[PDB]
Design an enzyme around this catalytic site. Structure first.
Site, PDB file in Angstrom:
ATOM      1  CB  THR A   1      -0.878   0.072   1.180  1.00  0.00           C
ATOM      2  OG1 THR A   1      -1.981  -1.043   0.999  1.00  0.00           O
ATOM      3  CG2 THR A   1      -1.621   1.363   1.423  1.00  0.00           C
ATOM      4  CD  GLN A   2       2.598   2.587  -4.814  1.00  0.00           C
ATOM      5  OE1 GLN A   2       2.976   1.324  -4.964  1.00  0.00           O
ATOM      6  NE2 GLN A   2       2.613   3.590  -5.563  1.00  0.00           N
TER       7      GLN A   2
ATOM      8  CG  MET B   1      -3.469  -5.859   0.464  1.00  0.00           C
ATOM      9  SD  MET B   1      -4.790  -4.717   0.196  1.00  0.00           S
ATOM     10  CE  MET B   1      -4.776  -3.859   1.580  1.00  0.00           C
ATOM     11  CG  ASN B   2       3.228  -2.936  -3.886  1.00  0.00           C
ATOM     12  OD1 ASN B   2       4.373  -3.392  -4.208  1.00  0.00           O
ATOM     13  ND2 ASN B   2       3.216  -1.843  -3.904  1.00  0.00           N
ATOM     14  N   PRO B   3      -0.698  -1.730  -4.966  1.00  0.00           N
ATOM     15  CG  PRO B   3      -2.092   0.157  -4.781  1.00  0.00           C
ATOM     16  CD  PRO B   3      -1.391  -0.884  -3.865  1.00  0.00           C
TER      17      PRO B   3
END
Lengths: 244, 233
Positions: free
Chosen positions: B1-2, B107-109
């Site tokens: 997540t960023q 969970m890392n788009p």
């Protein structure tokens, strides 16, 4: 004693690695292939033995491209050659990913060199049954290389390997002498077509199909490309003519 | 997540009778600071596809690198790389779509909104969307971010349904697209006047236009406006 030739990484009493030497045999037993470095690029050519009429012509391509600027051709166990090219492709992708710039031919050569040398370090693996001629254009010049099953490799003006390597080397040496100024991309292509035809005598028994590719700063923009159609036929004739 | 840092705004597009058009300004924003001004957000892949990207610029550059590889790789051991076995727009899309969804699923788009515009080998027009959630859809017109709110309403007035496509020409279409870009420059605070536009026509091929500018701007009425209610001068 004896048996020094049964395991791969064993030094015989005279300091040799027989398994690697036996691999070289598989190479000599293979088709003849060559490379000619010209004044702004390189040309690769290879002999494709036509086992029968059933082989679809122009299909079973042998030369391979690594990245977008490197050409590779090899003689010996074909599957071993592909394996090595695959590694070169990963090798090149990784380099470009970190450094952005496409891999310099010398750098690329050592990558293949280190990998092949690695298969002469353990008895759990077999040496590569192929000699590879490869090269291309980079930030500074064109480069031609040949890599042995031992992992040994050097930069060449012209190179050949396979069944009729001797004929080839002789023809190449002539060109080297008669052109200290440097052959051209256009010229090297024809010259290459000829040398394969000559070297094909050591296999005159079977009919073949010629394959050529080149990478010239001016002719292909530094990108490796296959010689097709007209340019190819023109060279096929230039040979058929000088073979008589 | 960023969380996105350097961003690109709207990417608008529509399909006409012979192909597709797609455009995106050249701004790379950093919050409300209009930081970078020469950002090309239209990525041509081959000569039949153009990928328009909005969102995080660092991620866009990464996607840009993934595309160069697709090309390089499709060339390997492929004697028909520039013929029957060349990259189709649908291949390029399905690929990016796959990646976008795998990434949101970890969970890392890849913080983007993407529109793949192109013409298939059989002449068919291709226009599909994919974003950071891995969500996808097609429509005669497609826009990301602000373009979705302001551009679509305009563009849809030209191609309201499938049947309107064959009735639309490159002139009508390119005109709609360019007016849309002007409207966005009027109401989007994260937009640049400079933009790039590309056309992929099944006949003329791929036309890539750089350094365009929003022109014919109405501002004159601003002089007749003073105060915020009762002020006369």
């Amino acid at each position: 004693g004896t048996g020094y030739d049964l395991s791969n990484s064993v030094f015989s009493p005279d300091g040799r690695n027989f398994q690697v030497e036996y691999a070289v045999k598989a190479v000599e037993n293979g088709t003849t292939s060559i490379g000619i470095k010209c004044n702004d690029g390189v040309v690769f050519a290879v002999e494709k033995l036509i086992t029968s009429k059933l082989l679809v012509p122009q299909k079973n391509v042998k030369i391979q491209v690594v990245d977008r600027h490197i050409g590779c051709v090899y003689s010996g166990l074909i599957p071993d050659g592909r394996h090595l090219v695959n590694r070169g492709r990963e090798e090149a992708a990784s380099f470009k990913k970190l450094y952005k710039t496409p891999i310099p031919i010398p750098a690329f050569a050592d990558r293949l060199g280190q990998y092949v040398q690695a298969h002469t370090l353990y008895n759990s693996v077999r040496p590569f049954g192929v000699s590879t001629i490869f090269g291309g254009v980079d930030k500074n010049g064109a480069h031609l290389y040949m890599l042995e099953p031992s992992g040994s490799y050097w930069g060449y003006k012209g190179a050949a390997t396979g069944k009729g390597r001797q004929s080839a080397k002789a023809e190449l040496e002539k060109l080297v002498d008669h052109h200290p100024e440097g052959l051209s991309a256009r010229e090297a292509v024809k010259q290459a077509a000829k040398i394969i035809y000559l070297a094909h005598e050591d296999n005159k028994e079977k009919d073949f199909e010629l394959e050529i590719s080149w990478c010239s700063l001016s002719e292909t923009n530094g990108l490796h490309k296959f010689v097709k159609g007209d340019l190819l036929q023109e060279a096929i004739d230039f040979a058929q003519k000088e073979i008589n | 997540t960023q969380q996105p840092i350097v961003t690109g705004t709207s990417v608008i597009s529509m399909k006409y009778d012979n192909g597709v058009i797609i455009a995106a300004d050249n701004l790379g924003s950093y919050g409300s600071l209009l930081r970078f001004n020469g950002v090309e957000r239209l990525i041509p892949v081959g000569d039949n596809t153009v990928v328009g990207i909005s969102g995080d610029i660092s991620d866009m550059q990464h996607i840009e690198r993934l595309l160069k590889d697709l090309v390089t790789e499709n060339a390997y051991d492929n004697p028909l790389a520039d013929a029957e076995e060349a990259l189709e727009p649908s291949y390029i899309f399905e690929y990016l779509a796959t990646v976008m969804y795998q990434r949101r699923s970890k969970m890392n788009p890849l913080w983007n909104a993407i529109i793949v515009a192109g013409v298939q080998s059989n002449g068919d027009q291709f226009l599909r969307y994919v974003n950071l959630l891995g969500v996808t859809y097609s429509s005669p017109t497609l826009a990301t971010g602000f373009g979705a709110h302001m551009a679509n309403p305009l563009l849809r007035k030209v191609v309201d349904r499938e049947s309107d496509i064959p009735k639309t020409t490159v002139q009508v279409a390119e005109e709609a697209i360019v007016n849309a870009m002007r409207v966005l420059y009027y109401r989007d605070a994260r937009s640049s006047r400079n933009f790039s536009l590309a056309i992929i026509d099944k006949n003329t091929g791929l036309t890539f236009k750089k350094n365009l500018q929003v022109e014919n701007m109405k501002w004159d009425f601003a002089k007749d406006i003073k105060g915020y209610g009762t002020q006369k001068i």
